[PDB]
Design a protein around this ligand. Structure first.
Ligand SMILES: *[C@@H]1O[C@H](CO)[C@@H](O[C@@H]2O[C@H](CO)[C@@H](O[C@@H]3O[C@H](CO[C@H]4O[C@H](CO)[C@@H](O)[C@H](O)[C@@H]4O)[C@@H](O)[C@H](O[C@H]4O[C@H](CO)[C@@H](O)[C@H](O)[C@@H]4O)[C@@H]3O)[C@H](O)[C@H]2NC(C)=O)[C@H](O)[C@H]1NC(C)=O
Ligand SMILES: *[C@@H]1O[C@H](CO[C@@H]2O[C@@H](C)[C@@H](O)[C@@H](O)[C@@H]2O)[C@@H](O[C@@H]2O[C@H](CO)[C@@H](O[C@@H]3O[C@H](CO)[C@@H](O)[C@H](O)[C@@H]3O)[C@H](O)[C@H]2NC(C)=O)[C@H](O)[C@H]1NC(C)=O
Ligand SMILES: *[C@@H]1O[C@H](CO)[C@@H](O[C@@H]2O[C@H](CO)[C@@H](O[C@@H]3O[C@H](CO)[C@@H](O)[C@H](O)[C@@H]3O)[C@H](O)[C@H]2NC(C)=O)[C@H](O)[C@H]1NC(C)=O
Ligand SMILES: *[C@@H]1O[C@H](CO)[C@@H](O[C@@H]2O[C@H](CO)[C@@H](O[C@@H]3O[C@H](CO)[C@@H](O)[C@H](O)[C@@H]3O)[C@H](O)[C@H]2NC(C)=O)[C@H](O)[C@H]1NC(C)=O
Ligand SMILES: *[C@@H]1O[C@H](CO)[C@@H](O[C@@H]2O[C@H](CO)[C@@H](O[C@@H]3O[C@H](CO)[C@@H](O)[C@H](O)[C@@H]3O)[C@H](O)[C@H]2NC(C)=O)[C@H](O)[C@H]1NC(C)=O
Ligand SMILES: *[C@@H]1O[C@H](CO)[C@@H](O[C@@H]2O[C@H](CO)[C@@H](O[C@@H]3O[C@H](CO)[C@@H](O)[C@H](O)[C@@H]3O)[C@H](O)[C@H]2NC(C)=O)[C@H](O)[C@H]1NC(C)=O
Ligand SMILES: *[C@@H]1O[C@H](CO[C@@H]2O[C@@H](C)[C@@H](O)[C@@H](O)[C@@H]2O)[C@@H](O[C@@H]2O[C@H](CO)[C@@H](O)[C@H](O)[C@H]2NC(C)=O)[C@H](O)[C@H]1NC(C)=O
Ligand SMILES: *[C@@H]1O[C@H](CO)[C@@H](O[C@@H]2O[C@H](CO)[C@@H](O)[C@H](O)[C@H]2NC(C)=O)[C@H](O)[C@H]1NC(C)=O
Ligand SMILES: *[C@@H]1O[C@H](CO)[C@@H](O[C@@H]2O[C@H](CO)[C@@H](O)[C@H](O)[C@H]2NC(C)=O)[C@H](O)[C@H]1NC(C)=O
Ligand SMILES: *[C@@H]1O[C@H](CO)[C@@H](O[C@@H]2O[C@H](CO)[C@@H](O)[C@H](O)[C@H]2NC(C)=O)[C@H](O)[C@H]1NC(C)=O
Ligand SMILES: *[C@@H]1O[C@H](CO)[C@@H](O[C@@H]2O[C@H](CO)[C@@H](O)[C@H](O)[C@H]2NC(C)=O)[C@H](O)[C@H]1NC(C)=O
Ligand SMILES: *[C@@H]1O[C@H](CO)[C@@H](O[C@@H]2O[C@H](CO)[C@@H](O)[C@H](O)[C@H]2NC(C)=O)[C@H](O)[C@H]1NC(C)=O
Ligand SMILES: *[C@@H]1O[C@H](CO[C@@H]2O[C@@H](C)[C@@H](O)[C@@H](O)[C@@H]2O)[C@@H](O)[C@H](O)[C@H]1NC(C)=O
Ligand SMILES: *[C@@H]1O[C@H](CO[C@@H]2O[C@@H](C)[C@@H](O)[C@@H](O)[C@@H]2O)[C@@H](O)[C@H](O)[C@H]1NC(C)=O
Ligand SMILES: *[C@@H]1O[C@H](CO)[C@@H](O)[C@H](O)[C@H]1NC(C)=O
Ligand SMILES: *[C@@H]1O[C@H](CO)[C@@H](O)[C@H](O)[C@H]1NC(C)=O
Ligand SMILES: *[C@@H]1O[C@H](CO)[C@@H](O)[C@H](O)[C@H]1NC(C)=O
Ligand SMILES: *[C@@H]1O[C@H](CO)[C@@H](O)[C@H](O)[C@H]1NC(C)=O
Ligand SMILES: *[C@@H]1O[C@H](CO)[C@@H](O)[C@H](O)[C@H]1NC(C)=O
Ligand SMILES: *[C@@H]1O[C@H](CO)[C@@H](O)[C@H](O)[C@H]1NC(C)=O
Length: 1224
């Protein structure tokens, strides 16, 4: 049955869900089964769960669970109900240090006494329905019981050994479970019905929406819900947008755990975490670990989170409703999510125990995340920080037992990575890792999809920085000095025991001070004794001696004095004559202050120079003659003589000269700019200045290198740039000069080729007509509504006023121009629908839009055409133009502002477009109906074939209007229209867009995309400027006025006022450029529609390029018109001999009146019968000549054909020989 058992996992009726854990293994499917249903007592080891499925009224039931080591100290379990009283027969249950019953019995053969120690020795009612299933599972010291509810109990245990006694119940009474299993619930109704449980394989684990299969590279697989995966911040959370941020999303191992189980686990930031990873595990030590949980009740237990620091300090996670652990108890007396819970960290160390306040716990904790460097986030916020973590222990307590295992609560080991994240409604929906060079380029911009084009790129530098340090500078000459000392003493006198005189000097002076870095002392000994010699000895009462100082003694100041000297240590000298007078010389003093300015040296080193050092041809940091930088130093073989360092005219260092050797070394950048040809959502080639890169082929273009994976010629350039083009396959090549359509130069004689076999092609061209008007509330944009800032802005006079006036004047001028342009005729509109139109042979179903009764306020509306549908839906990012938000609700303030209201709060209001797509399509339909309207009334609806025939006759008089002649043009036009429609439908498929370039569909759609993106880009660029702090103390005016005094604050806010005003002016200037450019576009469009659509043009090449223009039809397009100029292209040429004229009887010269008419001889009778035909030079329409087409000239010329009077009527059938007729 099992319906009642699975009904306990309370789940919503219409939800299909996945079950995991030690569940019943069924009866028939898989190995599983093993339903005993007998008193055979199978003793088993290593079992993790047991189940009983059918209670045949009241049959008995005996269970004994014990440790396999049979430990008497450990706790055993024995449950026994050998009674059939149902409700009144409560089962005797004992979780105790209990008799370890080996086989069977209430007491039985065993160890341990009955009641030496018990945790539970009461009786429990064990009555239930026949189909009710009871089960008990033990794992990780946690026990789950299925007695009508998912009861959970933490209990240290090791319960591998089981012994049983069953009683017969339907052949499926009792069974064991060794390993976890999985199930699928097709729940369709509440209660025990509408459950439809089935067993599962591993795939069902992947079915849960909150778990995923980790990629081998660690990337998050696509399509993940990210239902609770918040982005991690310290300060504030973005509500909507895209962010390139460093977040711990590089997942290594994912541990999906069913909600009904708690968890006792140990995690180390230094070792790969254990457990069965769902996807491809990566053996990398975690630096962050993220817990995704449904309900808060898991964490409320004290000690659930224990953080271990490298210092050994422990942080225990505690919660209560109280804010004073030191002044109150935290044993929880309340539950059921009542009252917000203050949650702290208690610090555990045997010096002083303190509590660190985490936060008021939010009502719904969904993900916690702890990470090394000492950081913890709850619901993606930086609540608290600590020192370097090294280990965590997780002690989690199941779930709320009211909606369980509708999936799995999951723990993820993650490493930090720079990723692009798209977030809406403060919830992540998609992510992109910034490791692939293609992904690196994507993250360089801010977008997930990138249009085809050449993008700037940085040359890949060294993976390991390890940059050596370079330093070049010629130093000063190492000046030396000799500090003389000379003592002059004439002693002895009489008998040698007397004195005569004594004196001493340093450098001929009574005092001296050392200046050079290197000094050497030298002492000299005038002692002249009248009796003989004198022994001289040196005393010392200083931390140094005259002999010691020379070695390496260093000072900041050193002065020698023969007399009193400030702060000077004393040194004396003794002179003993031959009989020992024993008198000192003059006392000597050193004033010394320690320092590196000077140093005592035993020998001078004059000539010693140079301390520079550098590394050649290695990307290194350098300090060259005061220029600090980072680059590559390379010995260059130039021969500069003057100068020591060389810089460009812009002040940039280029080369420096080793003065000692004369060599010169150039300094180049470590990395060079490159171009990536991002087409077809891939990097197909790189234009680089380097010799080689990570591509299979490299081609040496005249100006640069091109590295790609396709060395073949690029005959079909998908993306053209400068002098080159790149195909979709990565090939590069020069664009071949396409040969234009040949035009026959008119002439009077010789051969002439007349075009024929005309094929009716169509060429497309898009022309923008208007831009969306934008009003900028300058005052509130700059001052953010601050009155003081407005008063300061008043000092800037009329810049703001001019900005606003220019914007509004441009908007009004554009509006009035486009409004006066659009003229719509209702009679033409009547003929503009499929039912009214009769395009015999011409297939306008793609061009005409259907018109049906609109339930929206009754008024009838005409749906836009299929071509217009394709052009709008697939291009417009919002799908429809009505998506333009209204500011009516923007000031409501009851909801969090979106992007439109975000920019409106800055004073930017985007007025609706001047003309909606509905009116534009109406105008296009009016033009289409007008080109077939043959009169002032609707009854004059000329068939399109007649109109085409008239327009053809306009440029060349048709001589034989064959039905097949018109049918060929009709079918060619239909084929071209179908091809254009297919090209619009999709890119490079079902219509090969290999034929690409100007005047094609692809160019038009690229222009439309650029048009629809430019305005949004400009608006976002304007809005982001508010974030910038323009060299002020902050980007908030109120913050500046708070932290600063009024004097300095005015100076400070004046900095951003100029910055915002300058940024605002830049936006206005670029919009005026856009307005000026589009103005010329609509002037061309107005000229185009008048001279091409409403009437055929004699201006060759004006309407849709070269060729003979027959007509042109307009379709609506985003902020513009798409002209389809239909043009005739010749397919064959008839070669004829032009007749310059006739000279008949050598006396009458007769020529053709019409300059655009040629007289010739063709076909079999060009020379056999010498028959003449006149035809238009534009189209081959041979016709017999007429007397009205000829004029007489006063003189013949040699180029004219000889003729006689009798022969002329053969040439001219309409001629009447008046002399012959009158004389007969
Ligand atoms: C919320 O606010 C907290 C407050 O600190 C921020 O916590 C900091 O997080 C950053 C990482 O985001 C920590 O920086 C890490 O330092 C590690 C050790 O530092 C040494 O190495 C760096 C780099 O050589 C030296 O500059 C530094 O002086 C030390 O010598 C680094 O090894 C880490 O590098 C890792 O990331 C880089 C990418 O940036 C990889 O290339 C590396 O291979 C490596 O995987 C890292 O930079 C910082 O220590 C944390 N603060 C403190 C006080 O410890 C949170 O980041 C912030 N939240 C968000 C979302 O930003
Ligand atoms: C999960 O459950 C839904 C709900 O259907 C219910 O559960 C099933 C297990 C069956 O017991 C159903 O009888 C029960 O109502 C399943 O949706 C059901 O799918 C089946 C086919 O897979 C649908 O049958 C089809 O119905 C159409 C329209 O009547 C017929 O033309 C077909 O020939 C075929 O009979 C059934 O209509 C549909 N239930 C409803 C209410 O529309 C679902 O398949 C199942 N599994 C999953 C993965 O969702
Ligand atoms: C993991 O969390 C669980 C539950 O939060 C912890 O189990 C709990 O441990 C405390 C500490 O002894 C127990 O308190 C004691 O309860 C008994 C009654 O059973 C009482 O007589 C004692 O005076 C004392 O208050 C608590 O009962 C116990 N909870 C359960 C359900 O058994 C466990 O210690 C935590 N483990 C780690 C490693 O943090
Ligand atoms: C755990 O996840 C579940 C969803 O997987 C969420 O709780 C459940 O939310 C639904 C819809 O809000 C509740 O449905 C209805 O709730 C009432 C409450 O009395 C119930 O009586 C109705 O029959 C109906 O099922 C569902 O009860 C609820 N589950 C609970 C409360 O256990 C939520 O994301 C998480 N639940 C908690 C308590 O955090
Ligand atoms: C700039 O040019 C000068 C001039 O060549 C370079 O000086 C050179 O420096 C090296 C390293 O000190 C000298 O090598 C010598 O080796 C012998 C044997 O080990 C040792 O006894 C010397 O004391 C010295 O180290 C080399 O002779 C010397 N060249 C000379 C003196 O002409 C210098 O390295 C260049 N680069 C700079 C300054 O960055
Ligand atoms: C176009 O104009 C040229 C000259 O103005 C016409 O000349 C034709 O040229 C072809 C090619 O040489 C001649 O065919 C062969 O000529 C050679 C040399 O004269 C000779 O062996 C044969 O007579 C042979 O047919 C052709 O005779 C010559 N015809 C005339 C009237 O000059 C040419 O007819 C004009 N039309 C076309 C379609 O080229
Ligand atoms: C057409 O006639 C002109 C006029 O010349 C007269 O008619 C000729 C049929 C012949 O009888 C001439 O003697 C007549 O004077 C021709 O022009 C002459 O062409 C030749 C050919 O080389 C030339 O030598 C003469 O100078 C031309 N006479 C002029 C220019 O007065 C012409 O050749 C005749 N044929 C064609 C096809 O035009
Ligand atoms: C801080 O926590 C660590 C746990 O990581 C404690 O180390 C434990 O000490 C007990 C001593 O009774 C040992 O039985 C455990 O084996 C130790 N744990 C580990 C993982 O080895 C440490 O004593 C705690 N210190 C303080 C001051 O609370
Ligand atoms: C007094 O100072 C002079 C000045 O240098 C010292 O003379 C030097 O003596 C050394 C020792 O041989 C010579 O190598 C130098 O060439 C001498 N230099 C000069 C400029 O003469 C002298 O030694 C010091 N002492 C006395 C007693 O004169
Ligand atoms: C050029 O680069 C490609 C890219 O791997 C190398 O092989 C290509 O492999 C794909 C996939 O098997 C094939 O479809 C292509 O036909 C292969 N060639 C090309 C040019 O893409 C190739 O080994 C590289 N080196 C060369 C062609 O010399
Ligand atoms: C393909 O691209 C190459 C590279 O520019 C072109 O180079 C030609 O190579 C041939 C073979 O030696 C030379 O004879 C030509 O002089 C080269 N021309 C140029 C402009 O470089 C080549 O023309 C292109 N087309 C083909 C079919 O190889
Ligand atoms: C005329 O052009 C229309 C285009 O609207 C063609 O009609 C569509 O043909 C496709 C063929 O795959 C059908 O799937 C559509 O249901 C047709 N109707 C539409 C798109 O409205 C038509 O085949 C062309 N030729 C005619 C009418 O002779
Ligand atoms: C801490 O880790 C050191 C580095 O060894 C490896 O570290 C990470 C990257 C894992 O791959 C881990 O399995 C390796 O051991 C060890 O040298 C050091 O012994 C480790 N310290 C402790 C206490 O385990
Ligand atoms: C925290 O929650 C307590 C709820 O428990 C109830 O009150 C205690 C005193 C016991 O009597 C217990 O049996 C009750 O169910 C509140 O009483 C307590 O005031 C709360 N703490 C604070 C600071 O408000
Ligand atoms: C259980 O036994 C008592 C004693 O005879 C009796 O009164 C009671 O009705 C019984 N309960 C059931 C459910 O049979
Ligand atoms: C207590 O502080 C002293 C400070 O010298 C330190 O040496 C000692 O290890 C600390 N004791 C503990 C248990 O942290
Ligand atoms: C000391 O030596 C100096 C060296 O110049 C000499 O001139 C002088 O006569 C000597 N005797 C005395 C007493 O100075
Ligand atoms: C010095 O000149 C030679 C001339 O053959 C040249 O090959 C060499 O590259 C030059 N040195 C450097 C560093 O370029
Ligand atoms: C094309 O022109 C040739 C001669 O110029 C003619 O014979 C043919 O009928 C025309 N049409 C087609 C379809 O070839
Ligand atoms: C596209 O043009 C070719 C050549 O004119 C024609 O054969 C083909 O039928 C056209 N495609 C469609 C869909 O009409």
């Amino acid at each position: 049955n099992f319906r009642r058992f699975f009904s306990k996992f309370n789940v919503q009726a219409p939800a299909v869900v996945v079950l995991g854990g030690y569940l019943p293994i069924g009866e028939n499917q898989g190995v599983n089964s093993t339903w005993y249903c007998a008193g055979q007592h199978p003793t088993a080891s290593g079992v993790h769960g047991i189940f009983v499925s059918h209670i045949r009224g009241g049959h008995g039931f005996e269970i004994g669970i014990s440790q396999e080591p049979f430990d008497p100290s450990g706790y055993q379990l024995y449950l026994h109900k050998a009674t059939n009283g149902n409700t009144n027969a409560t089962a005797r249950l004992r979780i105790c240090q209990f008799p370890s019953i080996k086989t069977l019995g209430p007491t039985a053969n065993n160890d341990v006494t009955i009641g030496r120690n018990c945790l539970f020795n009461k009786a429990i009612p064990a009555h239930m329905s026949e189909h009710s299933v009871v089960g008990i599972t033990w794992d990780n010291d946690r026990v789950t019981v299925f007695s009508d509810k998912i009861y959970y109990f933490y209990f240290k245990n090791d319960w591998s050994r089981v012994a049983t006694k069953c009683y017969n119940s339907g052949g499926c009474a009792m069974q064991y479970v060794y390993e976890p299993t999985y199930y699928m619930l097709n729940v369709t109704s509440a209660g025990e019905d509408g459950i439809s449980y089935q067993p599962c394989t591993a795939n069902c684990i992947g079915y849960a929406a909150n778990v995923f299969a980790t990629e081998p590279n660690g990337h998050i697989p696509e399509g993940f819900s990210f239902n609770n995966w918040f982005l991690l911040s310290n300060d504030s959370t973005l509500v909507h947008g895209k962010v390139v941020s460093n977040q711990p999303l590089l997942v290594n191992c994912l541990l999906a755990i069913p909600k009904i189980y708690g968890l006792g686990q140990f995690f180390s930031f230094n070792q790969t975490i254990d457990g069965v990873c769902n996807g491809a595990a990566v053996q990398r030590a975690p630096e962050a670990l993220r817990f995704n949980i449904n309900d808060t009740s898991v964490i409320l237990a004290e000690g659930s989170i224990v953080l271990h620091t490298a210092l050994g300090t422990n942080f225990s996670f505690v919660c209560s409703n109280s804010s004073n652990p030191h002044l109150a108890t935290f044993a929880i007396p309340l539950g059921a999510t009542q009252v917000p819970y203050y949650c702290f960290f208690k610090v555990d160390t045997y010096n002083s125990t303190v509590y660190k306040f985490l936060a008021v716990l939010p009502p719904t904790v969904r993900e916690i995340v702890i990470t090394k460097y000492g950081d913890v986030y709850v619901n993606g916020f930086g609540y608290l920080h600590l020192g370097l973590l090294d280990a965590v222990t997780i002690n989690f307590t199941g779930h709320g037992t009211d909606d369980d295992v509708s999936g799995f609560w999951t723990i993820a080991s993650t490493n930090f990575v720079d990723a692009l994240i798209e977030v809406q409604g403060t919830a992540i929906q998609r992510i992109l890792y910034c490791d692939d060079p293609v992904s690196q380029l994507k993250c360089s911009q801010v977008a997930f999809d990138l249009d085809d084009g050449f993008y700037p790129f940085s040359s890949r530098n060294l993976l390991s920085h390890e940059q050596p340090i370079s330093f070049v500078t010629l130093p000063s000459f190492n000046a030396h000095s000799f500090v003389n000392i000379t003592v002059s003493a004439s002693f002895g006198g009489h008998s040698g025991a007397n004195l005569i005189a004594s004196d001493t000097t340093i450098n001929g002076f009574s005092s001296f001070c050392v200046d050079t870095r290197q000094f050497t002392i030298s002492l000299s000994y005038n002692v002249t004794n009248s009796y003989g010699y004198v022994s001289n000895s040196q005393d010392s009462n200083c931390p140094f001696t005259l002999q010691s100082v020379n070695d390496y003694l260093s000072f900041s100041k050193f002065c020698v004095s023969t007399s009193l000297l400030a702060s000077a240590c004393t040194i004396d000298l003794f002179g003993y004559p031959e009989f020992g007078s024993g008198v000192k010389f003059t006392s000597l003093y050193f004033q010394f202050t320690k320092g590196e300015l000077i140093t005592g040296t035993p020998k001078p080193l004059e000539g010693v120079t140079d301390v520079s050092f550098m590394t050649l041809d290695v990307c290194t940091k350098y300090t060259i003659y005061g220029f600090k930088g980072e680059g590559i130093i390379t010995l260059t073989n130039s021969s500069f003589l003057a100068g020591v360092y060389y810089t460009s005219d812009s002040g940039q260092l280029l080369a420096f000269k080793n003065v000692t050797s004369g060599a010169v070394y150039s300094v180049t950048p470590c990395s060079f700019s490159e171009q990536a040809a991002y087409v077809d959502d891939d990097i197909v080639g790189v234009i680089s200045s380097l010799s080689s890169s990570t591509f299979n082929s490299t081609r040496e273009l005249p100006g640069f290198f091109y590295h790609s994976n396709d060395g073949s010629n690029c005959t079909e350039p998908v993306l053209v740039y400068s002098n080159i083009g790149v195909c979709k396959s990565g090939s590069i090549g020069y664009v071949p000069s396409q040969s234009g359509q040949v035009k026959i130069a008119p002439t009077v004689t010789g051969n002439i080729s007349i075009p024929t076999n005309f094929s009716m092609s169509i060429r497309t061209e898009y022309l923008q007509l208007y831009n969306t008007p934008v009003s900028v509330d300058c005052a509130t944009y700059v001052c953010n509504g601050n009155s003081r800032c407005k008063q300061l802005l008043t000092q800037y006079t009329a810049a703001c006023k001019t900005i606003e006036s220019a914007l509004q004047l441009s908007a009004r001028l554009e509006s009035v121009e486009v409004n006066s342009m659009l003229t719509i005729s209702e009679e033409a509109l009547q003929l503009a629908t499929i039912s009214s139109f009769n395009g015999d042979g011409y297939n306008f179903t793609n061009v005409l839009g259907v018109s049906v009764y609109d339930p929206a306020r009754g008024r009838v509306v005409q749906k836009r055409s299929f071509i217009e549908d394709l052009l709008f839906n697939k291009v417009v990012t919002n799908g429809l133009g009505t998506v333009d938000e209204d500011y009516k609700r923007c000031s409501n303030g009851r909801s969090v502002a979106d992007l439109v209201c975000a920019q409106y709060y800055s004073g930017v209001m985007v007025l609706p477009g001047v003309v909606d797509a509905e009116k534009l399509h109406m105008y296009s339909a009016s033009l289409i109906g007008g080109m077939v309207l043959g009169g002032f009334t609707a009854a004059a609806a000329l068939p399109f074939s007649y109109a085409v025939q008239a327009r053809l006759n306009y440029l060349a008089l048709q001589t034989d209007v064959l039905q097949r002649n018109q049918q060929l043009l009709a079918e060619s036009f239909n084929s071209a229209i179908g091809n254009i429609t297919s090209a619009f439908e999709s890119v490079k498929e079902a219509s090969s867009q290999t034929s690409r370039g100007l005047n094609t569909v692809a160019h038009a759609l690229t222009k439309v995309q650029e048009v629809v993106n430019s305005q949004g880009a400009a608006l976002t660029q304007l809005t982001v400027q508010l974030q910038h702090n323009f060299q002020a103390i902050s980007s908030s005016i109120d913050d500046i006025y708070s932290r600063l005094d009024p004097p300095s604050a005015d100076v400070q806010v004046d900095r951003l006022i100029t910055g915002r005003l300058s940024a605002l002016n830049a936006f206005v200037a670029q919009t005026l450029t856009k307005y000026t450019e589009v103005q010329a576009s609509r002037k061309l469009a107005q000229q185009k529609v008048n001279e091409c659509v409403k009437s055929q043009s004699q201006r060759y090449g004006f309407c849709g390029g070269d060729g003979e223009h027959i007509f042109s039809l307009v379709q609506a397009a985003p902020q513009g018109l798409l002209f389809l100029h239909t043009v005739l292209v010749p397919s064959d040429f008839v070669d004829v001999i032009a007749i310059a004229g006739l000279c008949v009887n050598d006396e009458i010269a007769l020529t053709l009146r019409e300059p655009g008419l040629v007289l010739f001889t063709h076909e079999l009778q060009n020379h056999t019968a010498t028959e003449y035909f006149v035809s238009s030079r534009r189209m081959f329409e041979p016709r017999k000549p007429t007397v009205s087409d000829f004029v007489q000239i006063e003189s013949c010329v040699v180029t004219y054909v000889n003729l006689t009077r009798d022969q002329l009527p053969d040439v001219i059938p309409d001629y009447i020989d008046v002399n012959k007729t009158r004389d007969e």
